[PDB]
Amino acid sequence: SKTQRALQKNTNPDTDALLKSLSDHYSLELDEMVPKMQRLIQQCEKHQEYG
């Protein structure tokens, strides 16, 4: 009972909820941020050619 009470006090956020949040955040970074950065890299390469 002491261990269960300690788990409930320490459970905000639920470990399963937290792992889900972590997995969502990881997917968001790959879908939005990584491609944005790739686009910017490509743009910089074009500007070099313009130079």
Binding site: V34, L40, I41, E45
Partner: peptide
């Protein structure tokens, strides 16, 4: 994210 960290470095270099 390792994938993101790699892109920041590449963009800085360019």
């Amino acid at each position: 994210t390792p994938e993101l960290s790699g892109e920041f470095h590449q963009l800085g270099s360019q």
